[PDB]
Amino acid sequence: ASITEIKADKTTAVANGQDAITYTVKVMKGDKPVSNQEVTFTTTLGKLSNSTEKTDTNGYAKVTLTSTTPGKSLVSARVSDVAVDVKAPEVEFFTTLTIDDGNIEIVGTGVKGKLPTVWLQYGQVNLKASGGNGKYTWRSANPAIASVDASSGQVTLKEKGTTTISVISSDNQTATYTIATPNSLIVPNMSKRVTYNDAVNTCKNFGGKLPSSQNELENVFKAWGAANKYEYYKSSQTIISWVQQTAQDAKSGVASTYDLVKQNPLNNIKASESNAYATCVK
């Protein structure tokens, strides 16, 4: 005789044409349920499992809704032989939450691509998510390896290892990106310039080695750009760093350097003086 209940098990769903919202109506005649009553449903958006359904011996009728496009959806039901629709609670479908992992942005240069496999320690990249209701919250499974700003999606690489960065949207979805273990980690020691020999020892104590050449650090700049574009090194106007001596450099007491801020590869720098910073490669 009349629909006295019209519920939806959830008010949000993914527009993948599979995530379904189930609507349940109850037909009653006073304190008595109406069994085998035909109910017809209609929607303003999406696909209904069936346009018509018959109630149970308990007066209940059920149907599901899915959608391939995002947007608000309004389902209505009516007692078959009567032309008076009853509106159900409004629901919303949202695009699949995704992390644009092929366009990870290098914060210092704006270059977009895959995550570099050579990491300037504390280098930063921006991860972009899309889909869901647009309200994102980020997290890292292991902040020791890499941390992420919960609101911006900006990641800071810290130590060699593999972890995952996840983003969740408030419509209740989750997307994740896995950070692969890097081949090398670059660690500039900015507290003081040191002699070449002191740089050698510092790298050894850090369990690493001096850059093998200007080429090794040039590739670092190639991937990250000027180091002082990153929060951690913003106070440095120069990160001139020692590179391993060639046989000839050793013989003459000099070494070459490469500057992670200014590039500027130099040679014939007196090694016994504190002419550069110790940058370790781990």
Curated annotation (Swiss-Prot):
It is found in: Cell outer membrane. Residues 185-282 are annotated as: Intimin receptor Tir-binding. It comes from the Bacteria. Changing W242A: No effect on intimin expression or association with the bacterial outer membrane. Host cell adherent bacteria are unable to initiate host cytoskeletal rearrangements. Residues 93-282 are annotated as: Required and sufficient for interaction with intimin receptor Tir. Residues 3-94 form the Big-1 domain. Disulfide bonds join C203-C280. Residues 185-282 are annotated as: C-type lectin domain. The record marks 232, 234, 239-242, 246, 248-250, 254-257, 262-263, 268-269, 272-273, 275-277, 279, 281 as: Implicated in intimin receptor Tir-binding. Has a signal sequence, a periplasmic Lys M domain, an inverse autotransporter domain (residues 189-430) predicted to form an outer membrane-embedded 12-stranded beta-barrel, followed by an extracellular passenger domain (residues 450-939) with 4 Big domains (residues 450-550, 559-653, 658-751 and 755-842) and a C-type lectin domain (residues 842-939). Beta-barrel forms a hydrophilic pore for the translocation of the passenger domain to the bacterial cell surface. 'Inverse' autotransporters have an N-terminal translocation domain followed by the passenger domain, as opposed to 'classical' autotransporters which have N-terminal passenger and C-terminal translocation domains. Belongs to the intimin/invasin family. An inverse autotransporter. Adhesin, which mediates attachment to the human intestine epithelial cells. Necessary for the production of attaching and effacing lesions on infected human tissue culture cells. Anchored to the outer membrane by binding to peptidoglycan (PGN) via its periplasmic domain, thus helping in receptor interactions during host invasion. PGN-binding may also aid in resisting mechanical and chemical stress during transit of the bacterium through the gastrointestinal tract of the host. Homodimer. Interacts with Tir. This is Intimin. It comes from Escherichia coli O127:H6 (strain E2348/69 / EPEC).
